[PDB]
Design an enzyme around this catalytic site. Structure first.
Site, PDB file in Angstrom:
ATOM      1  N   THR A  44     -22.551   8.636   6.550  1.00 55.85           N
ATOM      2  CA  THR A  44     -22.980   8.124   5.222  1.00 55.85           C
ATOM      3  C   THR A  44     -22.774   9.178   4.109  1.00 55.85           C
ATOM      4  OG1 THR A  44     -24.575   6.847   6.404  1.00 55.85           O
ATOM      5  CG2 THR A  44     -24.878   7.077   4.062  1.00 55.85           C
ATOM      6  N   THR A  45     -23.193  10.406   4.428  1.00 56.67           N
ATOM      7  CA  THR A  45     -23.208  11.497   3.404  1.00 56.67           C
ATOM      8  C   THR A  45     -21.763  11.918   3.174  1.00 56.67           C
ATOM      9  OG1 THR A  45     -25.415  12.138   4.167  1.00 56.67           O
ATOM     10  CG2 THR A  45     -24.301  13.714   2.832  1.00 56.67           C
ATOM     11  N   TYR A 107     -25.003  -5.571   5.833  1.00 54.38           N
ATOM     12  CA  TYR A 107     -24.541  -6.719   4.930  1.00 54.38           C
ATOM     13  C   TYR A 107     -24.610  -8.032   5.690  1.00 54.38           C
ATOM     14  CZ  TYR A 107     -22.407  -9.802   1.666  1.00 54.38           C
ATOM     15  OH  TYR A 107     -22.300 -10.880   0.765  1.00 54.38           O
ATOM     16  N   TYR A 133     -28.004   4.121  14.840  1.00 57.40           N
ATOM     17  CA  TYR A 133     -28.495   4.695  13.567  1.00 57.40           C
ATOM     18  C   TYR A 133     -29.115   3.528  12.767  1.00 57.40           C
ATOM     19  CZ  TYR A 133     -27.477   6.663   8.835  1.00 57.40           C
ATOM     20  OH  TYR A 133     -27.425   7.187   7.569  1.00 57.40           O
ATOM     21  N   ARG A 138     -30.531   0.533   3.461  1.00 54.92           N
ATOM     22  CA  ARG A 138     -29.103   0.354   3.188  1.00 54.92           C
ATOM     23  C   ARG A 138     -28.497  -0.905   3.781  1.00 54.92           C
ATOM     24  NH1 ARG A 138     -26.355   4.919   1.237  1.00 54.92           N
ATOM     25  NH2 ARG A 138     -27.403   6.994   1.473  1.00 54.92           N
ATOM     26  N   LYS A 161     -30.560   7.689  15.551  1.00 57.87           N
ATOM     27  CA  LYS A 161     -30.935   8.370  14.312  1.00 57.87           C
ATOM     28  C   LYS A 161     -31.888   7.363  13.593  1.00 57.87           C
ATOM     29  CE  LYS A 161     -29.029   9.842   9.781  1.00 57.87           C
ATOM     30  NZ  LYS A 161     -27.725   9.825   9.002  1.00 57.87           N
ATOM     31  N   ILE A 203     -30.670  14.828  11.597  1.00 57.23           N
ATOM     32  CA  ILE A 203     -29.302  14.627  11.150  1.00 57.23           C
ATOM     33  C   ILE A 203     -29.461  14.621   9.639  1.00 57.23           C
ATOM     34  CG2 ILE A 203     -27.308  13.039  10.904  1.00 57.23           C
ATOM     35  CD1 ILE A 203     -28.020  12.124  13.976  1.00 57.23           C
TER      36      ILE A 203
END
Ligand SMILES: [Cl-]
Ligand SMILES: [Cl-]
Lengths: 291, 291
Positions: A44-45, A107, A133, A138, A161, A203
Site C-alpha cells: 500500500t505504502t 471494492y 492483510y 480501505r 497483517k 508492518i
C-alpha cells in the site's frame, strides 16, 4: 517466522512520476544498515495501485537485488481478482521473494466464504508463504477473526497483517490462533501494544523515517518488556499520528523528501502532501530528531 | 442527456467463469424490448473487477453491437490509477461508447483535490462524456458535493451516479448544481424519490430482473408524478432490498439464473449466492410476478 520491524517501503519517484531507481537502492541499503528486519516491496505504502505490472516486477527485483539476502523481502501481490492475485503471487515467487502480502479484495466486497475461497485458491496455486492483510477502512470488507482462524489451517498461510488498530480484537485473534500463524500490526499507533500481546512484528509506515527507532521498539515489545516498549515508542509516538494527516503514503513520502532521501514524485490519484500539513510535519520531524 | 432506466448489466458467465456471449446477446435484446433506456457495460454489477482488459473491451463491443444504436451504451471505465482510467476510457471512446462511467478511485483513498485532479486529467485526455460515481461503502472515499460541483465545471464531465442513498444530500447536490450536470441515482431503494427531486435516471441493479417495471418507475418519476412513482415502485420495492442480501452482483446474478436467463458463472472472490438466501429470493421473485 519473519519478526520485528518490517518497513512498508515507499516507491521513490521522480517529479514526473517515474520510479527513482537510485533513491530506492539507497533506501534499501539504509534500512539494512539501520536495523530494519524485513521489507515489504510494492505494498500500500509503495503505491502498488499505480505501478504497472512491469514496474511491480522491477521494484521487487531491485529490492531483492540490493538486499542481497541480508533480510527477508515480502512482496505485495494483493488484487481484487483471485486470478490476478495468483499471477502476481507466482511472479513474486519466481523473483525470489520470501513471502507475499495479500490485502483482502477491495471494492467488490466478497462474502466471508468468498474471502476464504480467494486465499485458499491462491495458497493452493502458489507454493510461497502468504500473509493475509485486513484494512476495512480501505477495502469495504472486514475479514473476520473467525475466517482468519480458518485460513490459518491452510499450510502456506503463515500470517496476517491486522491494520484495524483494534487492540482487543487483535489480542483475541492472537489468542484464538494459539500460534497457528503470525499476527503483525498494520497500525503504527498501537503496534507496540499488539506486539506486547503476542504479535510477531509491525508492518510499519513510521519505520520509513525512523527505522532504527522502530527496530528497537519491535525488539523490546516482542521480548515482552512493557516499560521499554512504552519508553521507546513514546519517542516516536507523534510520528505515528502525523504520518496519517492525509492518506498514507502522502505524508510519509513528503517526510522522506524533507529528509533529503527522495524526490516529490507520487502518482495520481495521490497528490503531494497539502501545503497546510507541511509545517506541522516539519515540526514533528524536528521534534523527533529526524531532521 | 441520457435519462431513464439505465441497467447496470451483469456479465453472464458459463459455469467455468468464461463470458457467456450467447446469454449476453439475449439479455441485451430483452432489455431493449422491455423498455430499458440505456445499458452500463462492465460496471460493478458487470464484475469489471474480475474481467481482463481484453474481456472488458469485448463485452463493451458486443453490447454496442447488439444494441445496434437503439439505445445509448455507457462503458464502466473506472480504475484506481488515473493512468489506467485514461487507458480504459480511451478504449471505450474508440469502441463507440456514448459515455463512460468512472467510480472514484477505491482502496488508495485520494484526497478531495486528488479526486478533482484524477477526473480533470481524464476529462482532458479523452473527448468523451464522463459520469462520476460515488459509492463510499465500497471505495473508502466519499466525493463531497462540493468537489462534484467543482467538477461539473469541467468540459466532458456530464453527470454523477450518487449511490449514497442519502436523499437529502442528493437533493442538495441537484439544487446546488442547477442543471450543470446530470445526477443519477445509484441506490434502487431510493431512486424513485431522487428522480422525483430532479435526478435524470437510475443506474439500476433491479432493472436487471424487472426492466419493464423499472423503465416505468423512471418514466413516471421523471414526469414528476409522485403518486404513480410511489405505486409503481411499491410493486418492486422488496426486490431493491433482497438483491443486496449478499454483496451485489451476487444476488442479482442468482435471480437471473432462477429466471432461466443466465448460467451460474461468477468469478472469485465473488461466489454464487449462499444456499440459504435462495429460497427467500425465489419467493421475492414470485411475489413480484417475475417467475
Ligand atoms: Cl503493506
Ligand atoms: Cl455501474
Amino acid at each position: 517466522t519473519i519478526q520485528g520491524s518490517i518497513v512498508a517501503i515507499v516507491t521513490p519517484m521522480l517529479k514526473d512520476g517515474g520510479v527513482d531507481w537510485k533513491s530506492l537502492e539507497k533506501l534499501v541499503e539504509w534500512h539494512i544498515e539501520q536495523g530494519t528486519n524485513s521489507i515489504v516491496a510494492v505494498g500500500t505504502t509503495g503505491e502498488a495501485s499505480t505501478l504497472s505490472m512491469e514496474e511491480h516486477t522491477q521494484v521487487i527485483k531491485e529490492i531483492i537485488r540490493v538486499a542481497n539476502k541480508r533480510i527477508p523481502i515480502i512482496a505485495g501481490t494483493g488484487a481484487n481478482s483471485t486470478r490476478e492475485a495468483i499471477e502476481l503471487t507466482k511472479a513474486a515467487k519466481d523473483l525470489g521473494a520470501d513471502a507475499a502480502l495479500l490485502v483482502t479484495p477491495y471494492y467488490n466486497k466478497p462474502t466471508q466464504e468468498g474471502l476464504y475461497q480467494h486465499y485458499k485458491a491462491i495458497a493452493e496455486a502458489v507454493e510461497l508463504p502468504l500473509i493475509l492483510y485486513n484494512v476495512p477502512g480501505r477495502t469495504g470488507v472486514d475479514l473476520s477473526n473467525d475466517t482468519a482462524v480458518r485460513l490459518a489451517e491452510i499450510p502456506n498461510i503463515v500470517g496476517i497483517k491486522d491494520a484495524t488498530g483494534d487492540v482487543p480484537r487483535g489480542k483475541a485473534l492472537i489468542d484464538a490462533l494459539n500460534g497457528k500463524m503470525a499476527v503483525y500490526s498494520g497500525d503504527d499507533e498501537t503496534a507496540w501494544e499488539l506486539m506486547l500481546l503476542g504479535a510477531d512484528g509491525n508492518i510499519s509506515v513510521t519505520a520509513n523515517i525512523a527505522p532504527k527507532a522502530m527496530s528497537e521498539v519491535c525488539a523490546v515489545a516482542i521480548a515482552k518488556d512493557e516499560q521499554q516498549a512504552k519508553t521507546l515508542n513514546n519517542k516516536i509516538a507523534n510520528l505515528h499520528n502525523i504520518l496519517f494527516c492525509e492518506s498514507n503514503p502522502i505524508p510519509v513520502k513528503w517526510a522522506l523528501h524533507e529528509m533529503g532521501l527522495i524526490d516529490t514524485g507520487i502518482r495520481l490519484p495521490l497528490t503531494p502532501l497539502a501545503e497546510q500539513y507541511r509545517e506541522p510535519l516539519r515540526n514533528a520531524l524536528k521534534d523527533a530528531g529526524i531532521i
